[PDB]
């Protein structure tokens, strides 16, 4: 000591709309969730609503019975505008609060569960990279369930704070996951190395004083 | 899975195993990647053309107008698309909200943002040239295709619609429509002959056929 830090590394992302990124989807054999999520992909309506956008993508992909939207009647879908129609949802965290400060991993899980949907919240501190990779890759091969991640953007080479978005696929050959980034005005979907995504989840959110992590969602 | 309307059997939904395989076995699918990145729900039942335009303009990376919530970032949205006099001079947003837009108006609205637009009424071409020219575009980055067609002629409810095309599957001779009415229907793979018939219908507003538009950067 002191540590001289001779070798330092920065995370390498592959964009979905790159030639390589396209190839990673086509060579993935853990990509069932990509198709329904792609059908539902939305832009977060404000710079704090990443979790709401992520939730409604998953609820619509699961075919969860949705609130009315007068503009679409008789058709009904979850939107960021109607997601808080259920008072139990507002009781977790109110929309005006989310619009200022976002949501924590535990709030994300509780907001989903307020609609009676099955959830399993995994803080990084309570699991490990090997179980994350294995369990998420399995979910990505399975219909009827989805995965949402909460991670510090800085640790995957983006700016900057905590973010939430669904995962859509896992490329086995490169050990990368595809993040369907709902901040569509800022970044494309990206393929991130498991080790970098793990590092980014294994950070402490000062709002919760707990680590970030990932949530499994399925229909009951 | 999502609660959209049951499709007529001549259509293969993107929301089906076969529909996924048609993307995986397509050799004309480059446009799917950027278009999927930009896919949006039309904000009302008249705004299909606006949703389609913004998907394409965002996919092309055009400098975009100011937004209500994303500053300093900018993207085309259904709320900011009409934020200049040149675009509004084509057709007023108040009218698009009640009547939609014709094929010619679609073209002019796109062109008001400075990009290169070619409008093809079905009457002025033929099915073989439609298939070849569109499949070629679908392999090429930096350009896109939007169709205007009568939904009933492909089995769907009901009137004239507008949405982008994302891919062409050679074995089945089907095009993938990225249907912006996401609350009602999934994206669908439609036989070329059905899509051709649906474009070769007379829009009562224009007394011209429907058709398709090619869009690329002017630069
Ligand atoms: Ca490519
Ligand atoms: Ca499946
Ligand atoms: Ca799954
Ligand atoms: Ca193209």
Resolution of the experimental structure, in angstroms: 1.1
Which residue of chain B has the CA closest to A70? B44
Interface test with A, best of B14, B69, B138 (most A CBs within 10 A): B69
A160 labeled binding residue: no
C-alpha R_g of chain B: 16
Please, are residues B215 and B116 in contact by the beta-carbon 8 Å criterion?
yes
Give the side-chain half-sphere CA count within 13 A for A217.
32
* Positive or negative: CA dihedral A80, B62, B39, B121: positive
The experimental method is X-ray
How many angstroms separate the alpha carbon of residue A33 from the centre of ligand 3? 5
Which of B14, B23, B29, B37 has the most A C-beta neighbours within 10 Å, making it the best mutation to test the interface with A?
A: B37
A/B interface, count of CB pairs below 8 Å? 78
The alpha carbon of A25 is separated from its chain's Cα centroid by a whole number of angstroms, namely 18
Q: What is the CA radius of gyration of chain A?
A: 17
In whole angstroms, what is the distance from residue A120 CA to residue A127 CA? 12
Residue A33 contacts residue A138 (beta carbons within 8 Å): no
The three-state secondary structure class of B207 is coil
* Cβ-nearest to A17 among B33, B70, B184: B33
Chain A closest-CA separation from residue B135 CA (Å): 18
Residue B146 near residue B164 (C-beta atoms within 8 A): yes
**Helix, strand, coil percent values for chain B (each to nearest 5):** 35, 20, 45
d(C-alpha A207, C-alpha A129), whole Å: 24
Is the Cβ–Cβ distance between A55 and A111 less than 8 Å? yes
Residues B182 and B121: their CA atoms lie apart, in Å, by: 26
C-alpha to C-alpha distance for B2 and A61, rounded to whole angstroms: 5
Nearest to B59 by CA among B141, B117, B162, B133: B141
Query: How near does any CA of chain A get to the CA of B177, in Å?
Result: 12
Question: In the beta sheet, which residues pair with residue A167?
Answer: A147, A179
Tell me, letter by letter, the H, E, C secondary structure of B81-102.
CCCCHHHHHHCCHHHHHHHCCC
Using the beta-carbon criterion (under 8 Å), do A185 and B70 form an inter-chain contact? yes
Cβ distance of A38 and B36 shorter than 8 Å: yes
Q: B31 with B20: CB under 8 angstroms?
A: no
Cα distance between the two ends of chain B: 42
- CA-based diameter of chain A, in Å? 68
Q: How far apart are the first and last CA of chain A?
A: 54
What letters, b where the CB count within 10 A reaches 16 and e where it falls short, cover A186-202?
Answer: bbbbbbbbbebbbbbbb
Please provide the DSSP assignment of B47-83 as one string. Answer: -HHHHHHHHHHHHHT------SSSTT-----TTTTT-
Report how far residue B112's alpha carbon sits from residue B87's, in angstroms, rounded to the nearest whole number: 5
Least CB-CB distance to B2: which of A17, A42, A61? A61
Q: Are B180 and B52 in contact (CB under 8 A)?
A: yes
CA–CA distance, A111 with A49 (Å, rounded to integer): 13
Identify the DSSP state of A216: E
Cβ <8 Å between B75 and A45? no
* Residue A215 C-alpha from the chain's centroid: 8
Cβ partners under 8 Å of residue B155, min gap 6: B7, B8, B10, B11, B194
According to DSSP, the residues that pair with A203 across neighbouring strands are none
> Using a CB-CB distance cutoff of 8 angstroms, which residues of chain A are in contact with residue B4?
75
Facing A63 at nearest CB: one of B1, B19, B182: B1
């Amino acid at each position: 000591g002191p540590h001289m830090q001779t070798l330092t590394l920065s995370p390498n992302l592959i964009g979905f709309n790159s030639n390589e990124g396209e190839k990673l989807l086509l060579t993935s054999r853990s990509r069932e969730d990509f198709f329904p999520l792609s059908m539902q992909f939305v832009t977060q309506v404000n710079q704090a609503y990443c979790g709401v956008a992520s939730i409604i993508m998953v609820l619509n992909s699961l075919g969860i019975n949705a609130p009315e939207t007068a503009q679409y009647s008789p058709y009904r879908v979850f939107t960021q505008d109607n997601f808080f129609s259920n008072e139990k949802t507002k009781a977790v965290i109110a929309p005006e609060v989310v619009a200022r400060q976002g949501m924590t991993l535990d709030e994300l899980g509780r907001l989903i569960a307020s609609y009676g949907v099955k959830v399993k919240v995994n803080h990084a501190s309570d699991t490990n990279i090997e179980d994350f990779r294995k369990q998420v890759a399995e979910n990505l091969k399975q219909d009827g369930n989805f995965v949402i991640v909460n991670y510090l953007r800085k640790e995957i080479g983006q700016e900057r704070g905590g973010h939430i978005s669904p995962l859509a696929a896992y490329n086995e050959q490169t050990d990368r996951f595809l993040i369907m980034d709902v901040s569509r005005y800022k970044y494309p979907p990206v393929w991130v190395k498991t080790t970098d995504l793990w590092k980014a989840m294994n950070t402490v959110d000062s709002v919760s004083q707990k680590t970030r992590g990932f949530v499994f969602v399925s229909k009951t």
